[PDB]
């Protein structure tokens, strides 16, 4: 399950090899009343960029979106959907911004269409700046 | 164009020259500039060749040896006075510094000695006393502040411990309600 890739995949603040005679894992609460999920504590995964078990700090803005693509490795694309007002025609126009959000692997079952909440953090890659903090399931689909 | 050391060729070259290099003087701090110089090894094709006589021949030459030119300035560092006139560290340097005579047209004859640096004067010794007096002042201030903060934190933690002892006794008697 773990140690897929080239280097050893461990959490950097834990010292796992103290002399004996299950590893403890580092995890934190990210503030703003976000409940850390049970799979973050009970899991066995590693992640640099998970907000709950990694070296990121959720700051700034706390936005939302709908899951619209999950084709990437440990990041999804959300589709922020909003309106915009022209001062001439007292009307609106429906716009959107697709944006790439690092989805931690503690959110283990999510399908596209779910309304996730994201938080601004350190820029994790070129076009990724947010993390999925909590996931709210789409309407219906309880089965 | 001048000759400079270590270029080691025969013709003329162009070098980037900087602070610390010869045949160049900088104007701004950090300026470097391609100037054109001449190598070490020599030929006919130059105006002036410079020579330094490094061992005197057995016969005199009138332009160079017969007259002598003294050093223009006396020494100015106190230990340089010491190692010119061969002093110890107890004999007074200031009467042994060289002074020059002064004679011109229409003016009073004078004499003139340089203000010698690095001698030990009572002002230097006073500054050296002042910095260590300031050091002991700073440690006295530090230990005073640390002791009064220790007294204050003992008092504040006594206050907080009595506060939580009030909480535990009050909710024991509330449990006795």
């Amino acid at each position: 399950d773990i140690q897929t890739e080239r280097a050893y995949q461990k959490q950097p603040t834990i010292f796992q090899n103290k002399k004996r005679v299950k590893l403890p894992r580092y995890y934190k609460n990210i503030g703003l009343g976000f409940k850390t999920p049970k799979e973050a504590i009970e899991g066995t995964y590693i992640d640099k960029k998970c907000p709950f078990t990694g070296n990121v700090s959720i700051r700034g803005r706390i936005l939302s979106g709908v899951v619209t693509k999950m084709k990437m490795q440990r990041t999804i694309v959300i589709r922020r959907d909003y309106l915009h007002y022209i001062r001439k025609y007292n009307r609106f126009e429906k716009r959107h911004k697709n944006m790439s959000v690092h989805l931690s692997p503690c959110f283990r079952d999510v399908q596209i269409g779910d309304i996730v909440t994201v938080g601004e953090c350190r820029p994790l890659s070129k076009t990724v700046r947010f993390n999925v903090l909590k996931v709210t399931k789409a309407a219906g689909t309880k089965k | 164009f001048p000759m400079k050391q270590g270029v080691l060729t025969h013709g003329r070259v162009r070098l980037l020259l900087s602070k610390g290099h010869s045949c160049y003087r900088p104007r701004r701090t950090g300026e470097r500039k391609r100037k054109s110089v001449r190598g070490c090894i020599v030929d006919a094709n130059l105006s002036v060749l410079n020579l330094v006589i490094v061992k005197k021949g057995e016969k005199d030459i009138p332009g160079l040896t017969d007259t002598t030119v003294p050093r223009r300035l006396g020494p100015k560092r106190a230990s340089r006075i010491r190692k010119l006139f061969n002093l110890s560290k107890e004999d007074d340097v200031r009467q042994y510094v060289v002074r020059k005579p002064l004679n011109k047209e229409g003016k009073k004859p004078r004499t003139k000695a340089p203000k010698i640096q690095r001698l030990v004067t009572p002002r230097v010794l006073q500054h050296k006393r002042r910095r260590i007096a300031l050091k002991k002042q700073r440690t006295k201030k530090n230990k005073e502040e640390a002791a009064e903060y220790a007294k204050l934190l003992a008092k504040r933690m006594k206050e907080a411990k009595e506060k939580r002892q009030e909480q535990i006794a009050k909710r024991r008697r509330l449990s006795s309600l």
């Binding site: 140690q3 080239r6 280097a7 050893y8 010292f15 090899n17 002399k19 070129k126 | -």
Partner: protein
């Protein structure tokens, strides 16, 4: 020079940013250090804000922490054996962060035999006739001998570590960035990460 700028590259949409200014000085890259293994050579770069960075260029020693026992000693780097990024950075011996080097286990052997007074390594049958290792292992007082006899219950080591001590050189991971700090520090690999990198090394060995 070498630039570190997002404006020379495409958008998220695959577009083309035409630049609005030429290359800046905070957008600066300098070439790699590529710290080999040899007698110590460190050049000093002065950087933004007037500070100093220490390019190692060839580098022999570094202090490694064996942290399950918590002993951290200055040690001679023997070899580079595994690198998670590039195998030609193993093929040439380049000290980088999180590469696997080998280091001679003599200071940790000295510490273990001086702290617990038990031999490690030590193919059995030989005793050092210079006699200093056995004057380290023997002849203590009856007040200090109970201290050694109670510390010698916590004196059994991992067998992977112990055969590394018997071969005489340990596997260790570079933690610092030697093109940045100028040092080649790090920690001795023991544990499941040691078994991970060992099976990586011998699978690469084939």
């Amino acid at each position: 020079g070498i630039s570190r700028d997002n404006w020379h590259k495409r958008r998220k949409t695959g577009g083309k940013r035409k630049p609005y200014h030429k290359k800046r000085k905070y957008e600066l890259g300098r070439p790699a250090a590529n710290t080999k293994i040899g007698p110590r050579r460190i050049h000093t770069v002065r950087v933004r804000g007037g500070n100093k960075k220490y390019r190692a260029l060839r580098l022999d020693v570094g202090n490694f922490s064996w942290g399950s026992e918590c002993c951290t000693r200055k040690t001679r780097i023997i070899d580079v054996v595994y690198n998670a990024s590039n195998n030609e950075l193993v093929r040439t011996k380049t000290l980088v962060k999180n590469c696997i080097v080998l280091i001679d286990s003599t200071p940790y052997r000295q510490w273990y035999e001086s702290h617990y007074a038990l031999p490690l390594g030590r193919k059995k049958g030989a005793k050092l006739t210079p006699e200093e290792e056995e004057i380290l292992n023997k002849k203590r007082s009856k007040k200090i001998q109970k201290k050694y006899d109670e510390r010698k219950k916590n004196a059994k080591i991992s067998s992977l570590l112990e055969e590394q001590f018997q071969q005489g050189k340990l596997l260790a991971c570079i933690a610092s960035r030697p093109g940045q700090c100028g040092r080649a520090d790090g920690y001795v690999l023991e544990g499941k990460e040691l078994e991970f990198y060992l099976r990586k090394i011998k699978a690469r060995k084939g």
